[PDB]
Structure formats: C-alpha cells, structure tokens
Subunit: 205 residues, 5 copies
C-alpha cells in the first residue's frame, strides 16, 4: 500500500493536469464494443435502446513510471476523476447516456490506460421489419465531440463486436454486429472528425 500511495501521489498531486491532446501531440484511442442487450425498440419514435460495454484505450507519456522505483508495481486501478478521459460521444443519441458501471480505470507503467464504461443508450433507429426473417439494420457513430482527426484518431482491434456476453433470452437476437472506423466532414467545420460506426443487424427471437 505504501508504494502505491507514493506512486499515486507522485503522479497526481505533483502534476498540473494533462490539458488534452493537440495537433503537436495527438492521440490515438482504441475502441471496442461488447453488446449485452437490445432492451427495447420504439416504433412510434424510431428509438432503440442498447446496453453495452465500451472499451477505451489510450497512452500518455505523463502517466509513465519506472516499476523499479515503486516496489515493482506495473499497474493500478484509480478513479477516472484522477485522469483525463476522451470525450467519446454517440452522434445520434436521443437521451443522455445512463452509466451502469463504476468510474474506475486501469493505468499501466508504460502510460497506457484502459477504461470500460457500461452504458445504456437510446439512439435513432427504425425497427420496422424487426419481426421478419431478414430483420433490420441500425447504426450509430461514436467519436470525439470536439477533437478533429488531427488531435484524436480512433482505431479498433477487430471489426467484430464482442457478442460473447449477449443476453441469450433477449427479445432480439443478433445476426451481426460490426465496428468500423470512418472519417466525417461537417458544414460547420473545416477538419475531418473520426468515428467508429457500430452497425447492428437484429430481429425478434
């Protein structure tokens, strides 16, 4: 405990806080989804409700330490309030995201961070035809709200959404689920913004 207390104190009390990524020092965030449930479909508003875990990974030089100086500690858990976290946002939500998991991340000695918030999201999707064999397809993009591709880039480790925790007695069965990097351009703004597009194809069970 003494060694971890020292490490956290050296990292968090001494530092002026990380001011986010910049054009000179950009950052790549890795995203992965594990889809747990399609809870609800609303055909009168074209809203669909998902429950998933969003795995986020990034790496900061300012979170590095030498494990030899801190009793061989290679990593630790810490409150997400102690650190910067990326502003990854759904581009087509219809409600504030509801947070289902404790806001705690894992920091590793090389400065890498893993953060896995569980969320419930309502987003724009037309479920008409969900009761057929073909099913429906729906999509929602996730990216930084405020940082362009020149400050935050995204990648995935796989294009396959993790379906191994999908609720087996859901009202909806999943036919496929992909997560794919894209580049968007907007009327408001000159620079490209990066997203990962979660595409889910499903039907009634």
């Amino acid at each position: 405990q003494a060694n971890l207390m020292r490490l956290k104190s050296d990292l968090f009390n001494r530092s002026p806080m990380y001011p986010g990524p910049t054009k000179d020092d950009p950052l790549t965030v890795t995203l992965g989804f594990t889809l747990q449930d399609i809870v609800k479909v609303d055909s009168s508003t074209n809203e669909v409700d998902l429950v998933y875990y969003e795995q986020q990974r990034w790496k900061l030089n300012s979170l590095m330490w030498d494990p030899n100086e801190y009793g061989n500690i290679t990593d630790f858990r810490t409150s997400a309030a102690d650190i910067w976290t990326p502003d990854i946002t759904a581009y087509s939500s219809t409600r504030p995201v509801q947070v289902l998991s404790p806001q705690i991340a894992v920091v590793t000695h090389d400065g890498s961070v893993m953060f896995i918030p569980a969320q419930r999201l309502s987003f724009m999707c037309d479920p008409t035809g969900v009761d057929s064999e073909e099913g429906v397809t729906c999509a929602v993009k996730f990216g930084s709200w405020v940082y362009s591709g020149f400050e935050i880039d995204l990648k995935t480790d796989t294009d396959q959404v993790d379906l191994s925790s999908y609720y087996a007695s859901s009202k909806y069965e999943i036919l496929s689920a992909t997560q794919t990097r894209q580049v968007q351009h907007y009327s408001c703004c000159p620079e490209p913004y990066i997203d990962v597009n979660l595409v889910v194809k499903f039907r009634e069970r």
Copy 2:
C-alpha cells in the same frame, strides 16, 4: 503539453473570472441550429421533442493571447466550466433541457469562443394535422433569460436552419426550418430582450 499548460494557467489561475457582459461592455452572441430529429409528438399535452445542436459564438478580450508567447498555439479545447458561457434559454420549454454532448468549448487566440451543445428539448407545440399534406408549424424562441438587448444581442449567420444531418428515417420530414432574430418586450421589465425564433414546419413521412 507544456505550452498549453502554461497558457491555461495564465488565462484561468491568475484571472478573477469574467463577470459577464454589461451596458458599458456588451456582447453579441451568434446562434445557429442544426436540427437532427423531431423524435416525438404528444397530441394530448401539445409537447414536441427535438434533438439539435446549438452553435454558440462570442468573443472576449480577456481570453486573448499572443501565439508567439505560447509555442504558436492558436486555439485550444477546454471545459466549459473554465469560462463564462451565455445563458441562452428556450422561452417555451416544458422540461429541463437534456444535454447530449460533452461540455467542452474551443477558444481561439483572438478571444473568440465556439460552443456546440447537443440538446433534447420538449416545448409547446400543437401537432394536430401533422398527418396531413400541409403539416403543422411550430415555434420556439431562444435568448438570454436575464440579459437585455443592452448587454446581450444575438445574430444568425443565416436564416436557414442546417438540415444536412437530419435523420433520414425520422417519423417526421421537415418542410422548412428557419432561425430569425426578434425583439421582445415584457410587462415585468422596461428593456428589450433579444431572441432567435426557431420556426419548424413538418409532417409525417
């Protein structure tokens, strides 16, 4: 990071906070809407629910810096809590506005600020006739709750609401959408208050 950390520290730790606009030093806020979805209509309460992005722009001398003194930094992202933001409020809401995007703004070296909150709003609107060819028209005014025209003025860059991110499979298609500056007077209060009136004409798709 070092240069941005310095800049933020020089702007935000040293300063007593900006105390808002005054009659002697008034401010013009530019507003623009991009309408994403008419999610829901309630014909038993005459409430309609929109999802949009509200682009806000203003400029303060106290947020100026010389980029040459801070490693050629011309702009940065920062939490909206670090700065003053205008109290732009819908005049006919029926619920607290729900915030859908991170509360982060962009500050530029000339002291100009851009802030683009995504919101879901329930407001007063009679949807009777939405299922016809003619459709319905509805309106909501946005302005400072507490500052008159002598402290906060508003303008738009265009009278055309941006419909280029409008959800193509919404239950409602948009026939027109305008945003127009107006001047209001109230029994309580001697001075004029400025608003931008969002007028949306729509029908079932």
Copy 3:
C-alpha cells in the same frame, strides 16, 4: 469589467454570508406569477402540471453599494448561489419542482434583488369536469417552508396573475387566475405562516 469584478469581490469574498431573516430584522418578499401553460392533467391521480415564472423581490442592506465608488454601476447579474434566496415552496406539490431557467438574479445598488425562476410543478388538483363549460377550479399555496410571518412576510403587486404569455394553443384555456396573500396556522407551530394562494380556473379549449 474591472469595476464589476471589484464590486463582486467586495460584496462576496470579504463578506460572511447573510444568515437569513430574523424576528429583529424581518423581510418582505414580493411574489408574482406569470402562467405559461397548463400542460397536463391526470384524472387517475388528481395531479395537474403547470409551467410558470415566479417573480421574487426582496431587499437586503448587506447588498448595498455606492455606484460612485464602482464606475457608476447601478446593478448587475449574478449567479443565485452567490446570494441568499427565499425558500418559497409550493405547499401541495406531488413531485420535486423542475427548474427551466438559469439560476441567475439581478442585484441593484439599493440592495434590492429580482429573481424569476421558470418552473414546472405537479400539484394536487381534481380535473373532473374540465371538459365542461363551467370548468374546474384548482389552488396551490406558495410560502416559506421554515420562516413564520415574524421573519418572512409576503405581498403581491396585483391580485391578477399575468396571462399575457399564456400559450394560445394549450389544451386548456384559462377562465381566471388570481394570486392572493393569506395567513395559515398549523398544529405543530405557534406562529402564523404567510402564503400566496394561486387560484386557477380552467377548461378544455
């Protein structure tokens, strides 16, 4: 800005906070309502939902300044958290009040304050007969929860509720709307408590 920054600092950093009104130094609060909408009626729970602005006015010696010492500033806007505000409470609500406007007040050099929160309120009201010509009458009292008449008194400027921003396409039209000072006595407590009784008579449009 320099002069207002000084004024706010002199008023709020130097002061120990106002400890509320007392028997020795009582306060009169002026209340006025402007009724915007009867949004909803629930005949299975006898709850009705209003949207209104509640104009509050009072005066404290501790908020006085000489405008000559602060660049001729006669008034300013400030966050309601910076100052004491009266605990005016609906006596027959069925839900927490929802706040629809920014919590910002106007302080004037003589120590007078104006604060105008927009609220949505669910309160106890039997709507049976609302669909008739006679309509229904409902009532809700507003007063200090904790201060008697010997510490907080109330008055109105008029007994007529302001109907000039009433939503013209509401489901309910207003037949009359009054706001009247009353004195209540309770088993628990020896002293009188003051309220303003909002009486609204309405029917389907």
Copy 4:
C-alpha cells in the same frame, strides 16, 4: 444579523462535527407524520405513493448556547447540511424518496432541533379491494437504517397521524392512520432496532 452570524460561526466553523450518537451518549428522536395525500395506487406492482411531512425532533448538548452572549437569540433557521440529522429511513420503499421541501431546520438554544421534510414515497402495499366499503390496510416502518436501540430510540407524541392537511379531493379517503413505536430483530444483527410503523387504512372516495 451580526449576532446570528457570530453564533453560527462559533457553532459551525470552530467545532469538529458531531460524530453521531453512541452507546455511551444515546439519543431519542421524536417522529410524527402529517399525511397529505395518497396520490397513486399501482395494482400491477403493489406499490402505493404517499405525500406527507415527517416531523423530526432531537437534542444535542453541542448545539447549546447562552442567549445572553448572542443578543438574546433563542433560535435560528439553518441549512440541514450544517448539522447532523438522523438517518430515518422507510423499511419497505420501492424508489428513492423524493424531497419536496427545502432542507432547512430550526435549532433552539437548549440544543433541540426541529426538522420537517416533505416527502413523496413509493412503498410496498397491495391495493386490491381499495374500491370496496371495507377498503385496504397498508403499512410502512420508519427507523434508523444503521443505529440500534442502544444508540437511537424513537418515540411519538401521539399515536394519531395528523390528517388535518389531508387533500379533500384525493382519490382516496382515509379511514384511519396510526403511528406506533415497535422493536425489530434481524438475522444479520444482534441488537434491537426501533421503528415507527405508519398504518393507513383507506378506500376510493
């Protein structure tokens, strides 16, 4: 104001906070209910919703003062955050309690405190038969969640719930309403826990 400011400062800035009651220094809390409305009944979930005021009284030596030293002040109003309050909790709620009144208490020079929170509570109750002449009976216990009888005891001034503010046009009329001290024992825990059991018998009006 000067004298009250001094008193509050002497009581709250100088003190280390009261650490709650103990076996060596136990406390008796007096409870009384005034029932305002049975708002809603849900026969598909067996939940019933009440609105009431819960009068709480207790006394601490650490809140004593000599009125002669503070300009003859015998009592004052203060925010409930300034002081310890008992953790009185409904034992069979189905939702977090909703608070309907300002969190402000009255402290008197002998160290006694009065606190009267207005609440809306959903609790476990089977309303089947509410539409008959006999009506239904329902019950909910209120006590400390964490303190046994050896640290917190309870009493009532009367076994009769105060029905003098009961909403006359409620959907439900009250046949009887009692509040009675009881002693409970639990598998988890060796000591007795005290409650006041609110028993309400009611039917459709």
Copy 5:
C-alpha cells in the same frame, strides 16, 4: 463524543486514503443478499425489478485501532464517503441502481467493515411463463467491475438468500433463491473475475 471525534480524526484526517486492494495485498469481500420484493416484470423488454439489501463485509489493517487508547470504543458508524468501499456491480443491469438506504457503514476495532445498501435493480430476465405453476428462473451476477480475482475475491456465508423479509403480499412468490460464487473469464482481459450469482425462481401469487 470526545473519544469518537479523536478516533475519527486519527483515522481519517492524518491518513493518506487507502488506494484499494492489490496483487501484493488482496482482499476478500463477503456478500449476502436479503430479497425484499420482486416489484415488477416487463415482458415487452425482458427487464425485472428487484428490491434487496446487499450485505458487504471486508477488513483493512489501516482501519485498526486499540480500544484502550480511545475510551473503550470497539466500533462506530461513519459515512461511506470517509472510507474505501468495494466496487461491487451487477453485471446485467439495464438502468442505474437506485439507492434506498443511507450511505453509512459500521467499522470495528479489528479493521472489519459492514455495509448494507438497500437497492432497486432493473436487470435482464425473461418473465414469460411467470403466470404458470413452474414459474421462471432468472439470474444476475454481482462482482468487482475492475478488480480481478488476484485483488478482490468473494465469498458467501451461505448459499441461501435470506427470504425472511420477503414482502408477503408481493405479486410474485419465491420458489427458491440462491447466491453462489463463480469465476468468469472475458475476451478483453487475461485474469479471472469473481462474482456471486443470484438465482431467483418465482411465479405469480
């Protein structure tokens, strides 16, 4: 009170906060459930709502004291904010958990802690067949969100859920209710995570 004030001050003001469990200093948390009500079932979303108390127990060397040095005090109640608490999380919730009891724990002189939060939980469960003699079975896992088995292990005192406070007039009667330790492995992560699996079998009464 003097003695307890000293103890709390010595434990909480002097200490740098416990930084959670580690591989070098792991922790075992004991969990037990007492099921109070199955409130609601939603067959269109496959969500079920429970109300229960979750008894949590663990032990830290840094919370030890010698009762002889503090007036023979063997234990005390304190706010949960004063101490570390395990991040025990439902793995298949569909909404944020609603907290129904005060966030206060009991600390004992040997460093052991007891914490018993009452919760309402919506979780993934197919109620189809609940209206039959056989009923339905549903399950939800509870464990650390972020700590593996090498930092947080779990155990139960019994595999039998405590049904002695189960609401006798619930819509649903309980046929069986068990709580059983398990070990999970996830695609994201190399180490095992421990849970207690709450299995409830029930039907309409």
